[model samples]
Target: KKWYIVLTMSGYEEKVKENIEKKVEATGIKNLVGRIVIPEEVVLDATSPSERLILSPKAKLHVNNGKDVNKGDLIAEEPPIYARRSGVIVDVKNVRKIVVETIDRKYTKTYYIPESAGIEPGLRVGTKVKQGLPLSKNEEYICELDGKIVEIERMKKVVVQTPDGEQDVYYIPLDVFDRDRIKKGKEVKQGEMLAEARKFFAKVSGRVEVVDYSTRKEIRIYKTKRRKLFPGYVFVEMIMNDEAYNFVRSVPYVMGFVSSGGQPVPVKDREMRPILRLAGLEEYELGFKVGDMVKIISGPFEDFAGVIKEIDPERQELKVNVTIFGRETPVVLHVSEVEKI
Candidate 1:
């Protein structure tokens, strides 16, 4: 496998994310590594009395092992995080992956595990999320706060109850760091220090992580599948640790566990429901369900288009039965390509 490094930009992370990407390509280093990104996090903030926040479409950026970067360099949303120091592009897998940093009191699909608190993501988006009175030993899904539906890069809204505040709004999923896991029902009563931790829900996609740079600390900007669910239970590649293992079991909704298949299979129903309720993870459908016609825009299938064979939005992949050389060929392509003619 090819290894890469991370270069962190202090401001305009998204811009920097895009800029540096171009920089890599311009420098003819695209072949060295593949992708770069601004770790996204689900964020929430209050704009007015009429609305509470849930999702804040923003995040920060980082590189692995501080590679492909130099210190004292000015990082822009476009290109180049002013490198304070210079180094080689090392491994871009994890460390290159950014850590999330939030400024506002985030509340959406995030969870905090107070010291010993445990939890993990049980379901992906499209799973049913329910709310009601406390479930005795189980947790309760409180009222969901909403936000204005803007185009991409909009803010998510959620409602919060503060002592002397007007149900302050909280934005979350501000930055994605693995499909974060959140557990709310179970409370941890510390000795005179009862700290509340937010539970993380699976992201809209897989384990894609994002970051929030509004604060000094790194926060998640967007997670692959946060609080949104589709149909089937989403599977993710996770590096299991004691915290990961234990927390996943505590999550409210989870179909089953995916690991080396250890002892007791971990399954939680309530946790999975929330995963089902998530939305907006897939690409813009062409409104062509199963039989709609389309044309190929790029790649080998360029200029060769045909009727829709099938669409698997769950995978952001599409299967289309197109005509190539007058032959009906069912070609598979990413959702990003293929347009409706």
Candidate 2:
């Protein structure tokens, strides 16, 4: 599946996610419409604030060591702790206090757990992350009819027709890795295993043991919540088809799609993580980190920062959100190209 950005009425995205999903299930586009993501950082605070995670029943645990994280992710936004920095959450017991190397005090959260705390931390500690990654779970795809793998479209698609006489039947293949075999025209019973998951492997080692995993997520103090990190945009990861694209573009709230030169520009790994990690685990830069304020530090906007800036490749590329004559825009500016200010 490829990633693409969709622009929609900023305020109505709550509906945009559901709109696309509902439409997909209604008929032709479901399989093509694939996965939808609204990039958002973890929001630890709703009523109050802090660098301290201060655990309670509302927290869910998921901290694995030495893992990387995005700058805009709200790992603790579940309820009790509201964190925003990219750092390690070293647990004395829980999501209380974790300081790794150079993370900011405000970005780090300290926690002490009760009831065998987790209890897992939140995400992996110590890994750096950019904006547009989500820390919460949303949710998947399923097939419907009793059909046969009548036709296959290589890497682009899969066409399954029903034995019930209708020649056209399913929308899958984002899952049908079995297509290599389906080319033999296998008959599929209703609800038969068309596909299960994308990434997994089994090894025949001597003996496998079931080590009990600690109950590490969702506590009394924690109730999971979701919010958008970037508003007005909903990123979609799916198999591309003109039919599905048309359906999505026609959905309510679609202002447009993210297109650069002339084509619909797909989202880059730089911005399309949370979804990929969702695909398998073992995974998903905000060099844009706080590109939030730096946005105004480049171009004519930065003229106010100091003096004349020269172009030299030695200066690193930094993204800054600049306001031109129109709306807010993002640009890559050399970090030290100019001085003074």
Candidate 3:
């Protein structure tokens, strides 16, 4: 039996379904007709004010400078002080809290050493600073970007400047990473399969918009890729007969239908909701859920397909089972490493 959707006029759905059923029997084409599904109920969005607008994107602070001087110090104090309100030492001038300018006119700051705060045995000039202490003269604030340090000079002042470039990082499931489907600086198209899971998996598809709140707006639109909604199963329309079954099974990397009692099952109207709702979103609710068939796009298992055995959303990681030498082996991956096929 085949299962598929048939479009009907909003008010005439029942009449069309009835007519089709009668025609199939009248024409003695019951086998070809198989099953005709006329969906009745559909999930509707409830009236809610909060759903009207998407939240505005905000700047993300990856790191903060002048916060604290801790035990495992990357940048430390030349002459550190234990302050009640700890802050980073920006520059060093003698041993005083006075600020100084380097040769490049960039202003750097340091803290003064008080007599009351004596150095302890574990303390070194730069290494022994603790959590409650002020920062050092030699210390500089660091961020996620990598760059070369440069010094700039002003009128009798020096400044430190570091310039760096940014790289686009794509996040996929770990299984995709293990399969080696992704790479640094590799260009990928939208809606391309990043990974696979169980029967229906996730895909890479999204849109980028330069949205304006008010009239002083310039908009540039572009297509992008990337989601997670359904878990173990995907909704597909196909006949349950031998031809359809054999075709699907013969396809490369295509898994067969979701089944119950050793027989293929059809997705019902109720199940269509999850797919529809996810389609309306900008990104997948979850990158990849458990029990999804995923393709490894990066790292060791590149091009291998597997089933998601476990997911750790907090860590943005997953474990996939891949067939190796006719045996199943679990591979761990980060969400960005794989793509949904």
Top lDDT model: 2
Better of 2 and 3 by TM-score: 2
Residues 162-213, model 3: lDDT tens digits? 1233222222223223233333323334344433321211111122223334
In model 1, the worst 10-residue window by lDDT is 89-98
lDDT of 2 by residue, 134-213 (tens): 22222111112212211112121224454343443222323334544333355444445444423211111111112112
Q: For model 1, what is the alpha-carbon lDDT of residue 29?
A: 38
TM-score of 3: 0.23
**Model 2 lDDT, full chain set:** 0.41
How does residue 243 of candidate 2 score in lDDT?
A: 69
Q: Please list the residue runs of candidate 1 whose C-alpha ends up more than 4 Å from where it truly belongs after superposition.
A: 1-59, 62-285, 298-300, 313-317, 323-329, 334-336
lDDT computed for candidate 1: 0.33
| Candidate maximizing TM-score | 2
